[PDB]
Amino acid sequence: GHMRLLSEDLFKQSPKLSEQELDELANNLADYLFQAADIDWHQVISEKTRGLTTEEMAKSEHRYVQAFCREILKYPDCYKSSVIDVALKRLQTGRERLFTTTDEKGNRELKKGDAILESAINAARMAISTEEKNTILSNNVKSATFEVFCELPCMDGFAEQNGKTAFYALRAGFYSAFKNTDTAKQDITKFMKDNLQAGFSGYSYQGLTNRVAQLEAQLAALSAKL
Amino acid sequence: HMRLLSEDLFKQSPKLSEQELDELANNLADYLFQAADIDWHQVISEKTTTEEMAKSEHRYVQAFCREILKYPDSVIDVALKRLQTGRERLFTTTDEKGNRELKKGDAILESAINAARMAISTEEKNTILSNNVKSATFEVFCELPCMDGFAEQNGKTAFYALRAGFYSAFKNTDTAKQDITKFMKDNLQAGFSGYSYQGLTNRVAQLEAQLAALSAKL
Ligand SMILES: [Cl-]
Ligand SMILES: [Cl-]
Numbered sequence: 001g002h003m004r005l006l007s008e009d010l011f012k013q014s015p016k017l018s019e020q021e022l023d024e025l026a027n028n029l030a031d032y033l034f035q036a037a038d039i040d041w042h043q044v045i046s047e048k049t050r051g052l053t054t055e056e057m058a059k060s061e062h063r064y065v066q067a068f069c070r071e072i073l074k075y076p077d078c079y080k081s082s083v084i085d086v087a088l089k090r091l092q093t094g095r096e097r098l099f100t101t102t103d104e105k106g107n108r109e110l111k112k113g114d115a116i117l118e119s120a121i122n123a124a125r126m127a128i129s130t131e132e133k134n135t136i137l138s139n140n141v142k143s144a145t146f147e148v149f150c151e152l153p154c155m156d157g158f159a160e161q162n163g164k165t166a167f168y169a170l171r172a173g174f175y176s177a178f179k180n181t182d183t184a185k186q187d188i189t190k191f192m193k194d195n196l197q198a199g200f201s202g203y204s205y206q207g208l209t210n211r212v213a214q215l216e217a218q219l220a221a222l223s224a225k226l
Numbered sequence: 227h228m229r230l231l232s233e234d235l236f237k238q239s240p241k242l243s244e245q246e247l248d249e250l251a252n253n254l255a256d257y258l259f260q261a262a263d264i265d266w267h268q269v270i271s272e273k274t275t276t277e278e279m280a281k282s283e284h285r286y287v288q289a290f291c292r293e294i295l296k297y298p299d300s301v302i303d304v305a306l307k308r309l310q311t312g313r314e315r316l317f318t319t320t321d322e323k324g325n326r327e328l329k330k331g332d333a334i335l336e337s338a339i340n341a342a343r344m345a346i347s348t349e350e351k352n353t354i355l356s357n358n359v360k361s362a363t364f365e366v367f368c369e370l371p372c373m374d375g376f377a378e379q380n381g382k383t384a385f386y387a388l389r390a391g392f393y394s395a396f397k398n399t400d401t402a403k404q405d406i407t408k409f410m411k412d413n414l415q416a417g418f419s420g421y422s423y424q425g426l427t428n429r430v431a432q433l434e435a436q437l438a439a440l441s442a443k444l
């Protein structure tokens with residue numbers, strides 16, 4: 001995903017954008033949300049492999065399981081006593097325990113179980129299309145994209161700054177944004193654009209306080225003409 | 227009072243009658259002033275004539291030093307550093323009569339502080355605190371059950387705004403109590419909803435209804 005999406009002051013400068021740049025940013029933000037959305041790899045890999053051999057796993061029709069197992073199988077002492085379920089156990093139970101593989105140059109190499117798992121998972125993330133990932137996500141896409149949204153640098157201290165209540169209101173608005181199952185992209189793009197234009201000031205103490213002050217002035221300047 | 231310690235004070239306060247609200251606000255204010263702590267190691271360090279201390283203009287300065295003098299060891303500023311370093315260490319002591327006693331380092335510092343405390347009234351504390359009454363009382367306000375989890379629920383920003391509103395409510399050191407009472411009364415009436423997501427979003431909504439209603443008049 002683009003660099004501009006990752007600015008920490010994104011919410012600050014978004015309202016200073018042109019309605020052209022704003023549309024671009026919102027579409028890109030949306031695209032980034034779907035692209036980076038995660039799934040339960042521990043679950044979907046295990047489901048795709050349980051009952052199969054090491055070689056069978058190595059040449060599956062799923063490129064993403066192929067990439068996953070390729071990483072795992074480098075460390076025989078992690079699965080060699082299903083293998084996938086064994087490795088998942090041993091790697092997590094053995095996080096910070098050093099596993100052994102053989103380098104390309106024939107040297108010995110040790111790597112922490114947790115790094116091994118994160119790598120295997122990253123490889124699978126690299127080998128799946130957004131299309132298949134979304135099909136696997138189903139309607140949990142709403143929670144997976146929101147999880148990505150909350151990880152953005154611009155969302156860094158949202159809950160702590162604006163409070164639990166505001167944060168959960170934001171979540172509700174986010175979930176509610178998804179109207180039709182076949183307009184996901186279009187919908188969340190609109191929610192993003194509306195809020196980016198206002199810098200998400202609908203969920204902040206200062207944004208709301210300012211709007212109240214604005215309204216008091218607007219009411220005053222109106223009740224005057226009459 | 228009993229209502230002051232309710233964790234749901236802000237929920238129940240908007241439902242109070244004028245009489246009850248005014249009483250609550252006044253009780254709350256009194257509590258803040260009663261419970262407020264004084265920065266003594268700063269008050270007296272800034273108010274310090276070894277002998278003129280014995281019968282000084284301020285009754286609280288003599289009491290505090292009258293116990294720091296008993297022990298052999300700006301000198302009061304030195305005694306503070308030698309005592310805050312004392313702890314379990316015992317300070318040699320003497321009496322006018324033969325009898326010689328002892329009192330551990332910190333055991334001395336508290337008795338001096340305590341003497342100062344017992345020598346003053348609440349409305350003397352306010353004069354002493356002066357401008358510091360702002361944060362002293364606010365620190366007490368924040369320990370109340372009703373104020374628990376305020377920042378977590380409403381956010382740090384709204385909490386800092388509350389503090390700012392709380393501080394600014396203090397106009398003159400002489401009206402400190404009357405001023406903070408009004409701040410408390412106004413907010414208690416509103417349940418402090420001026421500092422919450424729902425309160426502010428409710429406010430925006432009805433104001434937008436008012437504005438539109440009066441605009442359509444054209
Ligand atoms: Cl590029
Ligand atoms: Cl190997």
Ligand SMILES: [Cl-]
Binds near residue numbers: 126
């Ligand atoms: Cl690649």
Ligand SMILES: [Cl-]
Binds near residue numbers: 156
């Ligand atoms: Cl971050």
Ligand SMILES: [Cl-]
Binds near residue numbers: 150155156157160167
């Ligand atoms: Cl957050």
Ligand SMILES: [Cl-]
Binds near residue numbers: 170
């Ligand atoms: Cl909402």
Ligand SMILES: [Cl-]
Binds near residue numbers: 178179180181
């Ligand atoms: Cl839906």
Ligand SMILES: [Cl-]
Binds near residue numbers: 201
């Ligand atoms: Cl704003």
